Swiss-Prot record, chains A, B:
Lineage summary: Eukaryota, Metazoa, Chordata, Craniata, Vertebrata
Gene expressing this chain: SGTA
Name this protein carries in UniProt: Small glutamine-rich tetratricopeptide repeat-containing protein alpha
Parent-record interval covered: 4 to 54 of 313
Assembly notes: Homodimer. Homooligomer. Interacts with DNAJC5 and DNAJC5B. Interacts (via TPR repeats) with HSP90AA1. Interacts (via Gln-rich region) with SLC2A1. Interacts with HSP90AB1. Interacts (via TPR repeats) with HSPA8/Hsc70; the interaction is direct. Interacts with BAG6 (via ubiquitin-like domain); interaction prevents interaction between BAG6 and RNF126. Forms a multiprotein complex, at least composed of DNAJB12, DNAJB14, HSPA8/Hsc70 and SGTA; interaction with DNAJB14 and HSPA8/Hsc70 is direct. (Microbial infection) Interacts with Vpu and Gag from HIV-1.
Function, in words: Co-chaperone that binds misfolded and hydrophobic patches-containing client proteins in the cytosol. Mediates their targeting to the endoplasmic reticulum but also regulates their sorting to the proteasome when targeting fails. Functions in tail-anchored/type II transmembrane proteins membrane insertion constituting with ASNA1 and the BAG6 complex a targeting module. Functions upstream of the BAG6 complex and ASNA1, binding more rapidly the transmembrane domain of newly synthesized proteins.
Domain remarks in the Swiss-Prot or TrEMBL record: The second tetratricopeptide repeat (TPR 2) mediates the interaction with SARS-CoV accessory protein 7a.
Subcellular location: Cytoplasm; Nucleus
Tissue expression remark: Ubiquitous.
Similarity remark: Belongs to the SGT family.
Amino acid sequence: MKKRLAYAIIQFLHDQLRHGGLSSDAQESLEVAIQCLETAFGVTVEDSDLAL
Amino acid sequence: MKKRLAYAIIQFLHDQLRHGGLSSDAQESLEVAIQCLETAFGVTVEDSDLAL
Ligand SMILES: [Cl-]
C-alpha cells in the first residue's frame, strides 16, 4: 500500500473539514470518508468527535 | 476542494483497492470511502449503486 500518500490525503481531507468551507451535505459525506479511510490505511489524525 | 484533485484522489483510492494489499476489513472501508468522496465532491470513479 502507498501508506504515506494515503496519510497525506487523510490529513488533507481532515483539513477540508476545518478550513475547507464545504457545504453541510459535503461535510457529512466527507466525515464518513475520513473515518473509513483511517480504517482502510491504518493511520489516524486525532479528532473528536469523528465517531470512529 | 478542487474537483481535479478530488478526481485524482479517488482514482488513487480505486487503485489502492485493487493493488494496495489491504486487509478485507480495510478494503471494505476503502470501498465505502470512495462512495463517500464521490458524493462529497461530485465526481465519479467507481460509480457504485451502493453510494448514498
Ligand atoms: Cl474494480
